[PDB]
Amino acid sequence: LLKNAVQLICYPDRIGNNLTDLHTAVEKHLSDAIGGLHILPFFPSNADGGFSPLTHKEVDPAFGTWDDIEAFTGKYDLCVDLTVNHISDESPEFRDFIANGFDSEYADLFVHVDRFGDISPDDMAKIHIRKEKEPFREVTLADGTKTRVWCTFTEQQIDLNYDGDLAYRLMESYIGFLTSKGVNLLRLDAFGYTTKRIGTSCFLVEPEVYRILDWINEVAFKHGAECLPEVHDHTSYQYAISRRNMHPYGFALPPLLLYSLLDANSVYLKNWLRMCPRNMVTVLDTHDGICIPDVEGVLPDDKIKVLIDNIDARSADPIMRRSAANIHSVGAIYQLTCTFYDALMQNDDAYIAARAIQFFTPGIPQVYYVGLLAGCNDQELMEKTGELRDINRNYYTLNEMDEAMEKPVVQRLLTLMKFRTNYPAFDGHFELNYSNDSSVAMAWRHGEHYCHLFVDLNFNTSKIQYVDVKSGETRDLEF
Amino acid sequence: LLKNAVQLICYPDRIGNNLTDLHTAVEKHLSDAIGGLHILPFFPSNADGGFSPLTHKEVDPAFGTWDDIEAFTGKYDLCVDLTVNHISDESPEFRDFIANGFDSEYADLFVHVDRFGDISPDDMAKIHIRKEKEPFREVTLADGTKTRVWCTFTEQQIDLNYDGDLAYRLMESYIGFLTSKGVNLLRLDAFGYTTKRIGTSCFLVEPEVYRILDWINEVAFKHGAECLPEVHDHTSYQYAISRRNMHPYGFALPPLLLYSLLDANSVYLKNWLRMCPRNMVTVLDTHDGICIPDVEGVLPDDKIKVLIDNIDARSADPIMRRSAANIHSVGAIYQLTCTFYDALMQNDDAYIAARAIQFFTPGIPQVYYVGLLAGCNDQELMEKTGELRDINRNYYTLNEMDEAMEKPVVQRLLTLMKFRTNYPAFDGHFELNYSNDSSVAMAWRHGEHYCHLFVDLNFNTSKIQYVDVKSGETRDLEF
Amino acid sequence: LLKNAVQLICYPDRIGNNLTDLHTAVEKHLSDAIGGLHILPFFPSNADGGFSPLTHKEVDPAFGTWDDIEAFTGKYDLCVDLTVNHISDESPEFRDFIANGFDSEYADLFVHVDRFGDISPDDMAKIHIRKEKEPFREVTLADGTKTRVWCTFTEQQIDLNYDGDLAYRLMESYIGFLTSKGVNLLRLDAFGYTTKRIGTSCFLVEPEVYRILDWINEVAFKHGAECLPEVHDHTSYQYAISRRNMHPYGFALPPLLLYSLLDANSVYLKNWLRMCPRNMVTVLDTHDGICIPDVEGVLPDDKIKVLIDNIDARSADPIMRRSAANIHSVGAIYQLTCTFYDALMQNDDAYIAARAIQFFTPGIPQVYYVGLLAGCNDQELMEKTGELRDINRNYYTLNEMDEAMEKPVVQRLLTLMKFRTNYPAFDGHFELNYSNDSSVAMAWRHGEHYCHLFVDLNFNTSKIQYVDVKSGETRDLEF
């Protein structure tokens, strides 16, 4: 069972140089403000910012050791990535397949493209892939033979075969290892791609996807962990996840709030809050950029268009959906690339009000480390590395974090975070209040404990009242 | 706990002449096809087709007696209306208020408009009322005094005061009486208007509305009934109801299905099924006509406009929202007035596929008696009475129902109903299957029982495969 | 080679009672105004107004004999339908299949659906058929066996198998017989359906459709006939036909002209005229109603919507494309149902200007008999028969035709027809003239012969000047 407290999303090495510096900054600044951490992939990896792991059972020496990861458990919940879709081509299992071909004992762990026969143009066209190449990578075996394996992402990421047994055995092995290190929340990355079936989109193929998901959830349960399955697609999948006793993502909230604040409109936000899925992990910013498919239906299309044009006229290029020529179309944008503080135009009041609304939304709130420090678009890093998403992946030295922690806007955010992590009304029931169409009123009640948020979207004001239980007096949070 | 079986929606006197003839038709035709019945208001009433009851403790003698109603219980579940918002001005309670004024012991039962003081123009414009008159009725007391009471609907309907204690006692008295006659599901009419507060819309004012609803729900539970609170507004209210251990309505489905079949599009339909409110009572047609606010957000606005223009170009006038000049707007239409069979253009395959999708949707399916008999738009009835909704409130003699029962499409619908009412797979868990964007695939599993629906929206084909328990083998259902 | 003169489109029995009365009216009124005739199907038929022929080798006695048909040849070109897609289920060939099953010597003549195996939902959905049923009919053999044959249209129309040899042998027999009765122009009905291949749309499947089409063209030529292949789809198919020495239809013209006259716009008309296909047969009205797919690209979508809404707002219901819910969409309308005189609002000047533009368009112009007589929408017939297309299939007695011929608008149309049929400039080359955006100027030159049409679309004026070569002087045509 997880703590109902704010979580930090952070890299192993973007705050100081490593996991030790990370722990130093966390105890120095956040020890009363968070109850958990999502540490992004810290295993050996050769692509995609950690998500091409050679194994889930080892720490990259550049980051530290397993003792450095266990330095967090015992005081904080620990959320760690489980890359269910693929592993690195430098993993022992895949190098063995390169070395021994189909005589390898790990041969059935990978998807062999030629075992599907001819795939028709129609069936190629259905496949849900955001890259403009076929998801097939041709490799050279040790004996000079060439064979093709399924490859959704970059070529160093070779997809796992959930028609075989080896994939499930591999994942069960990772989970047992991760939970024995104190991981109690498993983020299931890109789970929607685990179902390959020609004739389908090969993405979230149901009911097959929920059987994979129930199996992982059951394995996690017997090992003391819960699951955070990650999908960027229609909101409905978030309810499917929730209804199967797993934690979905509140991916709808960031673009919904951005629109709500920017246009002084509370209509869609309140409708979403009244129906939002149970047991969410909520985010405003992530390590990825603001995802558009997650808010379809939650926000009318014309209002998503407003948000898209508003952001893209002011920040870096979005990430496009595949073969989508219409840059003003909802259906064409996958993610806007913009820090959340810059999406709100560095407006301190708007940003704190966004965080308050996040924190009064049902579910466990995650704060991304860049948003924690009110970071701006990192143009210089993006130009240094060539990775668009680095515009939202700032590095900070420990001194730079000390300095950022002194900003008025960050001190207001710390006060909120402490309140959300500690005040007991959040452990009770959510109760939305009536407001006009340009403001939001949100409350939590648990016995005598009670707190109330009012946000005016016109003027970006945030007011929290709460009951100090020893007396009956209502107090103001001062944030 | 209700039977997980098909229910019939019917008037007390539109199948034959009374409740005795209703029971005759039900035992002759439907005793293997339904497990429950929603008999529309049959009390003494002076407005709006039963929904202005003088009391809930009497049967209008024109319909029969309480024994005619208890003849249905014991074999059938019984869903009955509770008009929580208002009672008749000819009720014993309101006639005492006319006779004795504010010395009446029932003074707190009604809302006294002048006790609000002056209502600003702004605050009048907020009020959620679909009629273009102020919701205030001036009545003359016996002593010649004039005083005004709140009046949402027709003038013979006087709203109840949930700021007083009398309103809760009145409802609790009705519930006790209704449950002692075998009512085990209470449809809570127009409950959203029970919260009056100036400065608000006076409709679904939260959290007050859910306190009213939790209270009635508990009274019903300890008297052996569950609740079906009815709201025609945004889908989110259906989920709010659902998480409070009450049955919401599937009002989203009818216009969603109509669009899905007419435009051969399953995208929005499948997204809705994946996220559906829990424990809902599903409908296609009702006694009121296809309501549009209920599918907002569920379907994009341009597709709702498509549905609106398609039906309005060939059917009777819609019911508008209050001061809405744009007849081509979602925001301007309240209900389409059209029988469901005419909405699907009297296409037997399409109508049967729609019913099959309804029956495989999670929740209790209700079949409206006009839709049961595949009835068409009743132009003559609407012309005789002047009531638009009578275009969907056909009368049948007992002879005419016998005749309609023999239609091939009605016999096909009977087979569906028998299957949905009896086959045990629906008592297990729902399982959506992958399909393309012009067809739907839906399944139910409960142990060894299993049934699978495939509907192709292009050609309106319906196919159900299921496991024959007697043999074990998979069979095709002949409907 | 055909005469470059006006042709009449007519039924066998809609002018008087039969083919004898047809010849009477033609020799009485039209002997200097037309040089050819398209007589719509006059064979034994049991569906679709003649288009389900039991055989092409005999005349239905209700219409007359072959001598009544040969009474027209020798003075007029003779255009007759060849229903290449299907023959009647009461044909000797299909009745032999019912009696003898797959032992029938004609078994290979029809398409047997079960020889395709399972057809996926995707491959069913690709199929181009304008009806909301699967195009499969289950028939009972004489021995009680049930088997299914392909069926695009009504069930009495059984499609022919162009994967077999019998279909070509049958068609070659039909062409040989028709040409021996004097048919020198063969209308090839619905040829686009002759290619059935699962995985494709089963409509205009290239390159095979042109191979079927080259073959018919070659058989027709060696029997003394040319071909008029009939397809309603994108105009590009009209050019594909034209490049294969066949006559395409000018289906683009009717909706293009209507828009041009109704909105006083010549832009799209002139662009089409400058690039229009080469050997076409031009029409304004046909026996079917104004077909929309033929004008896509030729007219912008927004201007097609204008035409659709303008006509549908004041005449009978359109014929829809399959499962198309948006009644204001181009993609949803197949044909408007309105006589061409009513589509122009019975405006005599506008109508005569339309015919002059038709006649000055390159190609052989056909005049439909209802348009000949300036006929209005025949609602009484449509209500009597229940067929929508009958609003455009008026019956006239010989006397009613005598009266219609005396109407001033028809007398002007006669002068045009005589002029277009006889003046030699039409045997030369077309030359478009510069005009503003609300008028059209068209000329024909052949040596010393020259004629020029000016139409003002604002005021519906039409002027023709022509050279009397015997005298040299320019004269005005008084029509």
Ligand SMILES: OC[C@H]1O[C@H](O)[C@H](O)[C@@H](O)[C@@H]1O
């Ligand atoms: O390749 C896997 C992808 O999905 C993961 O869940 C991460 O969120 C993303 O950063 C990564 O690119």
Ligand SMILES: OC[C@H]1O[C@H](O)[C@H](O)[C@@H](O)[C@@H]1O
């Ligand atoms: O006036 C009350 C209204 O709400 C009721 O619940 C019924 O659905 C409707 O027929 C009635 O008119």
Ligand SMILES: OC[C@H]1O[C@H](O)[C@H](O)[C@@H](O)[C@@H]1O
């Ligand atoms: O079924 C054949 C169809 O195409 C034919 O060519 C005719 O033009 C049309 O009237 C008929 O309905």
